[PDB]
């Protein structure tokens, strides 16, 4: 249906602000397919609700603008993502990164903090696992440290998202502690899952020594190398990769912790929309040209995984949308949503040429950021920005007196393109997503 | 495809949180129609963003619940609603009730405070006016005072939403003051528009005397009578009406200002989620049993209007969702969202039976309210509630240090059922809505 949702002309004139060219009915009808998908790409913007897409479009593309990727997905709906209270099993209206990530990769709700386990601490398999078993190639890319909840919730079953490596699993997930007869720390289970392509950051946890098993004394990196993993650390090496399979999986660790953000801008402040000058985001001088971009990572991955005839399952995550949104930093937060949009375009481009791919773009939960009037005297942290329209936009963060703005529970946008995309429409639940992908791929 | 979007069973168990029974593809495909709507019902929730639909579902139906009306609409998407700066013609990221209401009834963007006029102050015809011209019956119901921006924007073209009656038009819209050769105040233009069914509050402005014209010296109420209008002021009278047409138009004034809210509850407070006990909303003891409910007014309207063989156009508004959201009062807000759902149900029930009706449910813009974690130490106004899950939900309002919480610019939900509904899917603009309706009805 869509392709061009930018305003038609002069937004001050009748029908100049319109985004529709004509009637969607027929076109939408010719976008609805129930034939099985061969591949699947799920782009997740951590903490990217509707208020985040809007504020990024307004700034990067202007009010009547249109994201060539994020907004170009025809089928749309809103979905629920509430977590559960571990004890009572009552809903916890505001999920975290882990409970939410677990819900779409597992199909079962859980308490906040849990990775790959229901409230009974019982393990369920992720869609990446079911994928690998069926023969498909699997990929996991993100801009966050690979041990972070979102990329991790596909390759690890643990009791606390804080169990990154050996050192922390023995203390917080004693039962998963390798020594204590457990599957191991997040990193260790990641290394076990052995998805074909895995790119992101978090190289520091791989500096830890395994406490038990066949590779004790050896750091996790050494273990990885020992186990047949190709390890790349920058744009160049990643580009040099010619193949990624079970015999030669790819592992890219491009940062100690999280990969750097693209734009730099001052942190929002109290009465900053009034006491302070409007700001304009400038590129981040810290981020080197050696650190790949989410779109480059997303691109290489599709290239390596597309060689598998059975198909592939890929999950991409723009992580720092969340982190900057926590930090109350409009610029880092917007640069990150733009960055994801590029990744989404690379996906959409392939999905279109191929024809049997199903692309889904959504978020794990809503977040703090709100778009308010220029003259707003708000209690939280505000900041004025110079959008592309030449107008000023004021963003507000007013849900935490703490040094971190919190997520929120508002239902949010879920959009998709491809085979079985109709299952994204209307109201649904984060967990239906698991079942939508399992069935589109034809999994068991 | 819809009908039942409630969690299938046990949310703690795999697939129990799912809302989807099966594959939507075909059901959705058999919902896509481009045949002309014979009628149209537009339900508007003032300030009802996604974060508002959620907090009211969580509380009234529980996090795994589903609004029988608001959530039972198959085709969904998000739409923008930015206003325009009057001077520069640049986008104003956060609209108001008027700029927004003008955009969907007229199809052109405008500055904030404007009803039926573009930024040049030029008048444009509304969809109610274009409907009356074509022979269709017209109705405009709302729980706010009829002079309020949303119901007014369909029958009045003015330069400031503040020009309610003769007295303030001479002041703020002197070029609209009847005396100075203008079309008149909002109330006066409403009395001229003469839609078949008009129900709501704002009976106090009808106590004003006309300054010029045929009926000067008389109250606007008296004029309404003189002009052949049926005046009903309570449910008993409303129920008693048997017909409403151009010869016998209906005018229901159920309150001096706004109709009373349905539920009572304490106003959110600073640190209210921690210094205070969770609250439970109670019905409003003040609301007389004689004041109709939005669903009752929506019901009688559809009854009288559906008698026209050409068809009808009806706009229904759940007004106080916005006002309570401004007031930082979760209970009034939610009761009002619940109030509208019942109206939506009445709408869908008719639409489904008839078969040629298009029902659209949305909001004019986003608002302040946020759902936050229960232990949230927020800088604004918080308040903890006892939901239906027996769980506690914390709501925050942190965008204004003033005594009024502000709207927000986040794109929000637009959902529809019926002929031409596919045009609601994807990203669109508030103004596109105008063209979709105009097209659906076959208006010139
Ligand atoms: Zn998250
Ligand atoms: Zn994340
Ligand atoms: Zn977060
Ligand atoms: Zn409004
Ligand atoms: Zn209103
Ligand atoms: Zn308002």
Swiss-Prot record, chains A, B:
What Gene3D superfamilies does its record include? Answer: Alkaline Phosphatase, subunit A (3.40.720.10)
Q: Which reaction does it catalyse?
A: a phosphate monoester + H2O = an alcohol + phosphate
User: What Pfam families does the record tag this protein with?
Assistant: Alk_phosphatase
Q: Disulfide connectivity?
A: 163-173, 281-331
Q: Which residues bind Zn(2+) 1?
A: 322, 326, 407
Q: Which SUPFAM superfamilies does the UniProt record give? A: Alkaline phosphatase-like
The entry's keywords: Disulfide bond, Hydrolase, Magnesium, Metal-binding, Periplasm, Phosphoprotein, Signal, Zinc
- Where Zn(2+) 2 binds, per the record, is at 46, 364-365
Query: Top enzyme class of this protein?
Result: hydrolase
Q: Which cofactor does it need?
A: Mg(2+); Zn(2+)
Broad class of where this protein is predominantly found: periplasm
Q: Organism's domain of life?
A: Bacteria
Its BP terms in the Gene Ontology are: protein dephosphorylation
Cofactor detail note:
Binds 1 Mg(2+) ion. Binds 2 Zn(2+) ions.
What family does the database annotate?
Belongs to the alkaline phosphatase family.
Name the PANTHER family on file.
Answer: ALKALINE PHOSPHATASE
Q: What is this protein called?
A: Alkaline phosphatase
> What's the name of its gene?
phoA
């Amino acid at each position: 249906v869509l392709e061009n949702r930018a305003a038609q002309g002069n937004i001050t004139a009748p029908g100049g602000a319109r985004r529709l060219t004509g009637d969607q009915t027929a076109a939408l009808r010719n976008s609805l397919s129930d034939k099985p998908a061969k591949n699947i790409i799920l782009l997740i913007g951590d903490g990217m609700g509707d208020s985040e897409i809007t504020a990024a479009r307004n700034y990067a593309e202007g009010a009547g603008g249109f994201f060539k990727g994020i907004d170009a997905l025809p089928l749309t709906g809103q979905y629920t993502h509430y977590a559960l209270n571990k004890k009572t099993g009552k809903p916890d209206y505001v999920t975290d990164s882990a409970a939410s990530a677990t819900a779409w990769s597992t199909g079962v709700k859980t308490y906040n903090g849990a990775l790959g386990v229901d409230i009974h601490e019982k393990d369920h398999p992720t869609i990446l696992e079911m994928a690998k078993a069926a023969g498909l190639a699997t990929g996991n890319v993100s801009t966050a440290e690979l041990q972070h909840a979102t990329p991790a919730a596909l390759v690890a079953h643990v009791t606390s998202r804080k169990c990154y490596g050996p050192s922390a699993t023995s203390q917080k997930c004693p039962g998963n502690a390798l020594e204590k007869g457990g599957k191991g720390s997040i990193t260790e289970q990641l290394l076990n899952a052995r998805a074909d392509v895995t790119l992101g950051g978090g190289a520091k946890t791989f500096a830890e020594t395994a406490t038990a098993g066949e590779w004790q004394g050896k750091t996790l990196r050494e273990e990885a190398e020992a186990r047949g993993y190709q390890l790349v650390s920058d744009a160049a090496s990643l580009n040099s990769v010619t193949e990624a399979n079970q015999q030669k999986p790819l592992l890219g660790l491009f940062a100690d912790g999280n990969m750097p953000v693209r734009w730099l801008g001052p942190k929002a402040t109290y009465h900053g929309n009034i006491d302070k000058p409007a700001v304009t985001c400038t590129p981040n001088p810290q981020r080197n040209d050696s650190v790949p971009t989410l779109a480059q990572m997303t691109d290489k991955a599709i290239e390596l995984l597309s060689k598998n005839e059975k198909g592939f399952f890929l999950q991409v995550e723009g992580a720092s949308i969340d982190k900057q949104n926590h930090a109350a930093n409009p610029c880092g937060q917007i640069g990150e949503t733009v960055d994801l949009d590029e990744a989404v375009q690379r996906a959409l481009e392939f999905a279109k040429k191929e024809g049997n791919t199903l692309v889904i773009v959504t978020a794990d939960h809503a977040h703090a950021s709100q778009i308010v009037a220029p003259d707003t005297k708000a209690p939280g942290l505000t900041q004025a920005l110079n959008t592309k329209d030449g107008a000023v936009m004021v963003m507000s963060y007013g849900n935490s007196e703490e040094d971190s703005q919190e997520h929120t529970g508002s239902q949010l946008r879920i959009a998709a393109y491809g085979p079985h995309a109709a299952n994204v429409v209307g109201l649904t639940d984060q967990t239906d997503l698991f079942y939508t992908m399992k069935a589109a791929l034809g999994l068991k």
